[PDB]
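Progress note, project year one: complex with LPR.
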Amino acid sequence: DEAEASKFVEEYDRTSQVVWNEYAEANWNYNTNITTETSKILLQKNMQIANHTLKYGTQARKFDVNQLQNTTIKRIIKKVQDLERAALPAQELEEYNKILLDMETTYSVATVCHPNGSCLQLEPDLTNVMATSRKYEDLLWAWEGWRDKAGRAILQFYPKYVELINQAARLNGYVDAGDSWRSMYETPSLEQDLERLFQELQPLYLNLHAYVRRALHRHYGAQHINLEGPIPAHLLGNMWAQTWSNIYDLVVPFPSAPSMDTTEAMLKQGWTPRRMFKEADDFFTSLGLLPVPPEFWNKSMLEKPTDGREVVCHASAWDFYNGKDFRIKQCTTVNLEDLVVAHHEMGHIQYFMQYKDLPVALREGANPGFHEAIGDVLALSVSTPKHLHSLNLLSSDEHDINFLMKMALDKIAFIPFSYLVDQWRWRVFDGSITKENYNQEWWSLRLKYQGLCPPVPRTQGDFDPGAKFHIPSSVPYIRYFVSFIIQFQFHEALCQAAGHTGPLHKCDIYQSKEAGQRLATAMKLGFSRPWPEAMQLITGQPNMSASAMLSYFKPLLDWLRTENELHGEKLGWP
Ligand SMILES: NCCCC[C@H](N[C@@H](CCc1ccccc1)C(=O)O)C(=O)N1CCC[C@H]1C(=O)O
Ligand SMILES: [Cl-]
Ligand SMILES: [Cl-]
Ligand SMILES: [Zn+2]
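Model obtained:
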């Protein structure tokens, strides 16, 4: 029986590599050239890989995992018993695949037009408007328009999507899709753990929220900002107000200390998307980590195509399951924000390369959060004033607070948003939220967690969640909340391993081999062991903890309390 098991695993692995490699190809061609032809081929490739999944999934279920001795074989087989979408009857499977395809296409090709004929795409057009406009009505036009065109257009597909993905989940042993997704963490206390983590960052977020609200009151007027209420969702410099980095100019703690125009600097000295990824590649190798293969530069799409073809711009990293072909798909824009994204994506590629020799079923991060944290960890060091100056993009207490504020506008502001997304989806999946209350419950959470309000009252027909990539693309979001917490835990440990002393925010792990070694040993484990082990390998302890992030921002927290206190700010939104 045990002999049949290891043989099954071997056959599953060698056959999966081939089928998954072929699927990755068709999926890539569609993402990089949305045509009715590539669509048709992809949907056909869907059925083929589903066929393979059903064949081996059916076999795997015949094994009594409880009686399997080898833990690795036991772990792989248990995982293969989950057919995911392939568990759906043929009819439902094709409908589900088409549903997903249509939602993704609808989102990626949506445009917002003016009365003339000027239509803007999300990236970089609408994104730039949200980041640079300081006119309430212009920001509103883009904010509302995007939701009218992308959000509303997804609503017709969602209820069916929810029904089918939940059905698939039940056919695989779970109670609903949310249950299935949370299982990726293999942590029964997950919901409580995440709740405790969120609560620990509340003091910091609430103080940042009040400070920013005051600055907005200063700029947009008392008639448009309630000093004791939520902040209008279109004023944070980002379409989803998930990161507030772009309004740094409106909230700079010490304006007497001017900061260079980072974007102007990159452009001023000919930085290109390729340069950007080359710098990221250099940081990884400096740590002793792996460089991306030559093939990466030849097959990746680092720029928005200008040959008439429509593509999915939303940045992503791809593993073609042959241990050789890895690629990034990003309509890269030359600015600091995308430089961080490039590192984020390169972090995924590094993970792909580190565990490429493990059985395919175990080729994943310790948990989804780990996969998301890698690139961000390095980017933390890249973002330091001193590091940016070494790249010639930049030229002290007050400077520390200014830097910490810039970092907080990104990292701290994101905490409540990254927490909120799946709190909403989990309740949609378990049936607590019906299509009648999709939007209203989304905004109840936007208010409760982020303290934001819609600048325009929502009406029947609106489906704002659909205006956020991950929703129509069906990509879990809690991984980002986990990532933002643990990436600071990783930064703290790697900095200590690198011999750094003094304030954590001043640490730059560039070219530290000790740091790189901890990340490598952890990444090599892939999904072979419970994530707490990878956590231990990197940090010396096994739990998730907000301590590192709180320690990183401690100076800012103190500055924020003193500043908000002297202005008599009322934290929160009664
Ligand atoms: N200026 C846009 C940059 C996007 C980069 C990043 N991309 C995503 C992609 C997710 C994906 C999974 C499977 C298939 C297709 C896509 C990523 O995690 O790399 C992302 O979404 N991130 C990175 C952090 C948070 C989250 C976001 O922006 O909400
Ligand atoms: Cl929204
Ligand atoms: Cl996740
Ligand atoms: Zn990612």
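The longest strand covers residues 316-319.
Residues 1-574 form one domain.
No further modelling is planned for this target in the current period.
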